[PDB]
RNA sequence: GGUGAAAUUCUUGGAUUUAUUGAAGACUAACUACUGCGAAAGCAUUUGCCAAGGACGUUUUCAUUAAUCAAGAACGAAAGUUAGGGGAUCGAAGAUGAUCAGAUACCGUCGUAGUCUUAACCAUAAACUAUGCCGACUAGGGAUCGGGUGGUGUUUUUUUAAUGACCCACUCGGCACCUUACGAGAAAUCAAAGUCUUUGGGUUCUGGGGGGAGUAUGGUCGCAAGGCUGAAACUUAAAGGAAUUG
């Protein structure tokens, strides 16, 4: 599931929360691979996307908002978009 | 006293059943307290078709079957010559006639 | 039995009559406690801890290997949780159960069976303040219990 | 050869119903009903006046072309009783010695996965 | 029971069978008989134009009919007319069915009823409603009474069973659909890819329903209609 | 007599008992 | 002056380098920085303007047109909506109901945005003072309030005058009745208390 | 401590305009004042600025709503029958 | 059309019926049974997500954490209440047609509140197994559900493996049924309603002739309907649990 994937990976691996952080990731090469809130603004999702593929990296497309991605990582705030550096335990690279 | 154990139908462990209606009469009869009788009959008859028989195309057709599922009440069943009434020694025999 | 419930399924392990054991065994409890503090070390509790040196290796109780208990073995390191195996994941129903229910208002059957929960978290907190294992004045709320799990 | 038809057959209690109708059913030939053929508002469903109605139909199908029949019996289905009438039936033996060819009899009675609710109230139909 | 209505007019005879023409009906290409019969209009005069009064109308036909022989007894058809031409209307496939009879007598008690039905649509913008029946029966020396599935290989064979009809409907649009479904040959894939499950007696699989059409589709008929 | 409609007739009853009561107050 | 929200619809001008505004009546889930559609191929999605013909059965539609080209006609007030009943392909008209229950057949090329006029269930609050529906009619018109009609002088009203306030003589009032014998209730079938149904 | 025990935000009308008259206005009221979700940017930040326009605090939106809720049931159930009338027009 | 028979009623401006398409709201047939789950009330079209749960298996873990419970609470069918939405079916009031000596009833035709839902109250039911809960022992038999165990057993795959589905024996837990009474009971009956003048496993609640009367009164909860709690004065040998014969 992808919940449980997130969840073996939220704690294991090294990861970027948000924008900002993510967009460096995105720029460095660090990022392997990036996770969409739905309600993102599309505008803000068009910019996302167009780095990964300008930097060959793959992107997901969470279904729900900022709200439970950011429970969905366990945290107790709203997280729009995630970088993962590296999966560390789970599979979620090479699956999907 | 109690007539019987089961005493008005099967619900054991239930509590509820979800019921249904009467064919006759509408009822809100309970479904395992009903009295269901299953109709099983040649679409025209067993006799009437030699009639019917010679002015087919198809010789021999099917002979098709109706089916039907009859819900009758305890006050319906009883007053048409079905289940009505047994001994107290009889009300026992769980077996069909 | 079965306090919270009505069944009465009586399905448990059988432990075999012979207190030493298995007659076929390897290298005695010098690495057995050995093993058993690795695992305790990566955050498996002793049930967990159990299990895998059961069926992994051959181990029919760490209780006749060793002279001691596998909680006791780790108590003995200073590997013992802040709170009992058995209560922490009385508590971390509940907050599994508590957060359903800040979705589902309709679901009073979420609502009968947390009243429950809690219930055998409150019977097993009272209890283990008298063992003073945990201390007093120590009370299960919902506004910590999800700090409390992680 | 033989020019189809489909009978419909509906002829329910307190009332019998023959009429035959094109290939597409849209196109209607030859109706008459139990209570055109008797005076009583009683024996509308009476077997003679099912077979009444099917001789009349019969008398008129062969003048309009149609020489075979489909056979289509119906109850009034739905909540209600779901079997077929008195006379949904002896209408079968007038258009059937009448002349008329037979073929794929089936009955067509409308029957729901449990609609709505039947009427005469929980209690029933008292009498 | 004739003098029984008090009025007959409110607001206040000639015969119409010297009025009707009878057409023609032909059934589509992959169907060893396109005679169905004959339907009647009345005459097209100059402001009814009686060619759009019969353009659709459905009819009903048993498959053993188009057919021949009487295995494909049940297996009711509907054809719908699509294109009319000197009293020779033609008609294409409007659905299938089965008989009330047969669908009944499928059903019996002690043993699991299963449905499955999809929706999915076709290459030709058919959009069909593809539904399925099946019932586990009691196996060849079978001691027990009931042969239930367990009711959670049922969801098995729900999922099996409609992922096949997905499958197979896109890319067979509507001659090689209606000529798959001729030989049950879709019933044979079900029952090898179940019979790891249980039996599943009586896979007939269920009526056939069209949802939507594409546009009034005029442009090669030819292997339609020959 | 049936003790649906003898409970019934006590309630009309009680009904009747607080209207002329609370007049007095 | 009404209670429903407006819209500020902004279009490009077909015809110049001009940016043409439009001030339509808001569907209730019209969001300020969405996109309309205006056309006949446009798609089924609330905010768009689509005529009556090129809709499917069972459509929510708002802000009605009943003769095209009216730019707007029935369906204007808050929580209301118009639902198409069946289309008469040829001699092209559209089977619909209007708000007050009514079936009204119009041109097929009629328009009208998908979906109902924002601000319902205004009415179910009670403004619970006279002063509240001081401010109700302050803007909209002076209607308010009313003195009754058999509070009155025979001179200053039919129902005027006597020593008992009453009507005296029935307040069912005929349609060939002139001005200055209308006061009352105009051409009613019948009075009273509404039982049964609407039996339309 | 608590205040009142009933009136709740109808204190404001003192003994005035009946029981049942002050309590249809206070449902509408807690409905109309109260802060509702952001669809948009996901915060508690919708607020009534007048009959049916709710503009949320945060992201600067606003969106055509009810008298007294930002989404009416009787809207909603409009909302999905288009959905799926228009799901089958492009079927 | 309706019915025992009719009539109110709709109908040549087309009723019913046939055909074609569409909309609405509710239900979830047949499968569906002495079968499943749930504390009970209750729960059946399909798929997804969320959390939960009994049983089972266990050479895992803790270690008496347990049984039952004043006060205090969660849930609690249907009807009912308040505010909306919905309002397709059926439909307490009512209008009619009957029936009748009467009929404001049963039956026929319509028909509003409700039936449906969201939000909040209501706390009742022959809410019945008219059997409180926990634990122990005491007779036989088959069937079934979930899990398991064993068996060169049968079938399908790749004749052939594993699986899955069946068969046989056994077992743990469960919904039940069949026979008999050494046992109980007042009998009806009961494997529990047995192990009670040979009278004691633990524990909760309720009753003391029938009525007056679930009334009066005082509190208390509720928007209300009413719920909870709850007497007395006074009256008087008079209805069944159960069986028997007529
Ligand atoms: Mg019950
Ligand atoms: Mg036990
Ligand atoms: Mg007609
Ligand atoms: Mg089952
Ligand atoms: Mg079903
Ligand atoms: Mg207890
Ligand atoms: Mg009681
Ligand atoms: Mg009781
Ligand atoms: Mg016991
Ligand atoms: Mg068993
Ligand atoms: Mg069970
Ligand atoms: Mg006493
Ligand atoms: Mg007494
Ligand atoms: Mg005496
Ligand atoms: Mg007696
Ligand atoms: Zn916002």
Request: with cysteine.
């Given at each position: 599931?992808?919940?449980?994937?997130?969840?073996?990976?939220?704690?294991?691996?090294?990861?970027?929360?948000?924008?900002?952080?993510?967009?460096?990731?995105?720029?460095?090469?660090?990022?392997?691979?990036?996770?969409?809130?739905?309600?993102?603004?599309?505008?803000?999702?068009?910019?996302?996307?167009?780095?990964?593929?300008?930097?060959?990296?793959?992107?997901?497309?969470?279904?729900?908002?900022?709200?439970?991605?950011?429970?969905?990582?366990?945290?107790?705030?709203?997280?729009?978009?995630?970088s993962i550096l590296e999966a560390g335990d789970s599979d979620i690279l090479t699956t999907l | 006293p109690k007539k019987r154990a089961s005493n008005g139908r099967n619900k054991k462990g239930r509590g509820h059943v979800k019921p249904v209606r009467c064919v006759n009469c509408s009822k809100s009869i309970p479904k395992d307290k009903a009295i269901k009788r299953m109709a099983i009959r040649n679409i025209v008859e067993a006799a009437a078709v030699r009639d019917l028989s010679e002015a087919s195309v198809y010789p021999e057709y099917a002979l098709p079957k109706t089916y039907n599922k009859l819900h009758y009440c305890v006050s319906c069943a009883i007053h048409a010559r079905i289940v009505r009434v047994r001994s107290r020694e009889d009300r026992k025999n769980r077996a069909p006639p | 039995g079965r306090m919270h419930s009505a069944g009465k399924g009586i399905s448990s392990s059988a432990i075999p009559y012979s207190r030493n054991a298995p007659a076929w065994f390897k290298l005695s409890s010098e690495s057995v406690i050995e093993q058993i503090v690795k695992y305790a070390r990566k955050g498996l509790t002793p049930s967990q801890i159990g299990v895998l040196l059961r069926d992994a290796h051959g181990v029919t109780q760490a209780r006749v290997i060793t002279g001691n208990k596998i909680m006791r073995i780790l108590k003995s390191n200073g590997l013992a949780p802040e709170i009992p195996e058995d209560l922490y994941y009385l508590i971390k129903k509940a907050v599994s159960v508590r957060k359903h229910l800040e979705r589902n208002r309709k679901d009073k059957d979420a609502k009968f069976r947390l009243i429950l929960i809690e219930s055998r978290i409150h019977r097993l907190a009272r209890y283990y303040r008298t063992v003073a294992v945990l201390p007093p004045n120590w009370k299960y709320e919902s506004a910590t219990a999800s700090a409390l799990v992680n | 050869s033989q020019v189809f038809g489909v009978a419909r057959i509906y002829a329910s209690f307190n009332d019998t119903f023959v009429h035959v109708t094109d290939l597409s059913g849209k196109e209607t030939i030859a109706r008459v009903t139990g209570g055109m053929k008797v005076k009583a508002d009683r024996d509308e469903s009476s077997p003679y006046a099912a077979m009444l109605a099917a001789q009349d139909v019969a008398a008129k199908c062969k003048e309009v072309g149609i020489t075979a029949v489909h056979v289509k019996i119906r109850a009034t289905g739905g909540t209600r009783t779901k079997t077929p009438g008195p006379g949904g039936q002896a209408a079968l033996r007038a258009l059937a010695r009448s002349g008329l060819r037979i073929g794929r009899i089936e009955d067509v009675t409308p029957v729901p996965s449990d609609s709505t609710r039947k009427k005469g109230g929980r209690r029933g139909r008292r009498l | 029971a004739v003098g029984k209505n008090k009025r007959l007019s409110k607001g206040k005879v000639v015969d119409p069978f010297t009025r009707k023409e009878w057409f023609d009906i032909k059934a589509p290409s992959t169907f060893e008989n396109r005679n169905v019969?004959?339907?009647?209009?009345?005459?097209?005069?100059?402001?009814?134009?009686?060619?759009?009064?019969?353009?659709?109308?459905?009819?009903?036909?048993?498959?053993?009919?188009?057919?021949?022989?009487?295995?494909?007894?049940?297996?009711?058809?509907?054809?719908?007319?699509?294109?009319?031409?000197?009293?020779?209307?033609?008609?294409?496939?409007?659905?299938?069915?089965?008989?009330?009879?047969?669908?009944?007598?499928?059903?019996?008690?002690?043993?699991?009823?299963?449905?499955?039905?999809?929706?999915?649509?076709?290459?030709?913008?058919?959009?069909?409603?593809?539904?399925?029946?099946?019932?586990?029966?009691?196996?060849?020396?079978?001691?027990?009474?009931?042969?239930?599935?367990?009711?959670?290989?049922?969801?098995?064979?729900?999922?099996?069973?409609?992922?096949?009809?997905?499958?197979?409907?896109?890319?067979?649009?509507?001659?090689?659909?209606?000529?798959?479904?001729?030989?049950?040959?879709?019933?044979?894939?079900?029952?090898?890819?179940?019979?790891?499950?249980?039996?599943?007696?009586?896979?007939?699989?269920?009526?056939?329903?069209?949802?939507?059409?594409?546009?009034?589709?005029?442009?090669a008929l030819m292997a339609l209609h020959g | 007599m049936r003790a649906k409609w003898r409970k019934k007739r006590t309630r009309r009853l009680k009904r009747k008992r607080r209207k002329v009561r609370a007049r007095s107050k | 002056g009404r209670g429903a929200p407006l819209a500020k619809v902004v279009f490009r001008d077909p015809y110049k380098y001009r940016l043409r505004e439009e001030i339509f009546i808001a569907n209730e889930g019209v969001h300020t920085g969405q996109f309309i559609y205006a056309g006949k191929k446009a798609s089924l999605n609330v905010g768009n303007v689509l005529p009556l013909g090129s809709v499917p059965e069972g459509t929510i539609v708002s802000n009605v047109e009943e003769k095209p080209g009216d730019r707007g006609a029935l369906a204007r007030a808050s929580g209301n909506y118009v639902i198409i009943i069946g289309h008469n392909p040829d001699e092209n008209k559209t089977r619909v109901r209007l708000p007050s229950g009514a079936k009204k057949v119009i041109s097929s090329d009629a328009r009208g945005v998908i979906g109902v006029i924002a601000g319902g269930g205004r009415v179910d609050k009670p403004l619970l003072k006279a002063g509240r529906a001081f401010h109700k009619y302050r803007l909209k018109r002076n209607s308010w309030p009313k003195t009754r009609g058999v509070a009155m002088n025979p001179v200053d009203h039919p129902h005027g005058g006597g020593n008992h306030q009453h009507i005296g003589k029935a307040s069912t009032i005929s349609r060939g009745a002139v001005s200055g014998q209308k006061a009352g209730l105009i051409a009613a079938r019948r009075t009273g208390l509404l039982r049964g149904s609407q039996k339309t | 401590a608590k205040r009142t025990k009933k009136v709740g935000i109808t204190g404001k009308y003192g003994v005035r305009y009946g029981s049942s008259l002050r309590r249809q206005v206070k449902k509408l009221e807690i409905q109309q004042h109260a802060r509702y979700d952001c669809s948009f940017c996901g915060k508690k930040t919708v607020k009534r600025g007048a009959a049916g326009i709710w503009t949320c605090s945060c992201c600067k939106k606003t969106v055509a709503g009810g008298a007294y809720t930002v989404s009416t049931a009787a809207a909603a159930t409009v909302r999905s029958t288009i959905r799926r009338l228009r799901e089958m027009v492009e079927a």
């Open positions: 599931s992808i919940n449980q994937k997130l969840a073996l990976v939220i704690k294991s691996g090294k990861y970027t929360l948000g924008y900002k952080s993510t967009v460096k990731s995105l720029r460095q090469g660090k990022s392997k691979l990036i996770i969409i809130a739905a309600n993102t603004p599309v505008l803000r999702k068009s910019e996302l996307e167009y780095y990964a593929m300008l930097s060959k990296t793959k992107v997901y497309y969470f279904q729900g908002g900022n709200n439970e991605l950011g429970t969905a990582v366990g945290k107790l705030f709203r997280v729009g978009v995630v | - | - | - | 019969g004959k339907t009647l209009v009345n005459k097209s005069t100059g402001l009814k134009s009686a060619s759009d009064a019969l353009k659709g109308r459905v009819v009903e036909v048993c498959l053993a009919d188009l057919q021949g022989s009487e295995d494909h007894s049940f297996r009711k058809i509907k054809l719908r007319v699509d294109e009319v031409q000197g009293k020779n209307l033609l008609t294409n496939f409007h659905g299938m069915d089965f008989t009330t009879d047969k669908l009944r007598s499928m059903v019996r008690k002690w043993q699991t009823l299963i449905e499955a039905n999809v929706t999915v649509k076709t290459s030709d913008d058919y959009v069909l409603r593809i539904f399925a029946i099946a019932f586990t029966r009691k196996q060849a020396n079978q001691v027990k009474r009931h042969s239930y599935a367990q009711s959670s290989h049922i969801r098995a064979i729900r999922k099996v069973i409609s992922e096949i009809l997905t499958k197979e409907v896109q890319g067979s649009t509507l001659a090689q659909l209606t000529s798959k479904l001729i030989p049950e040959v879709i019933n044979k894939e079900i029952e090898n890819a179940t019979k790891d499950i249980f039996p599943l007696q009586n896979i007939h699989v269920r009526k056939v329903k069209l949802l939507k059409q594409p546009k009034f589709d005029v442009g | - | - | -």
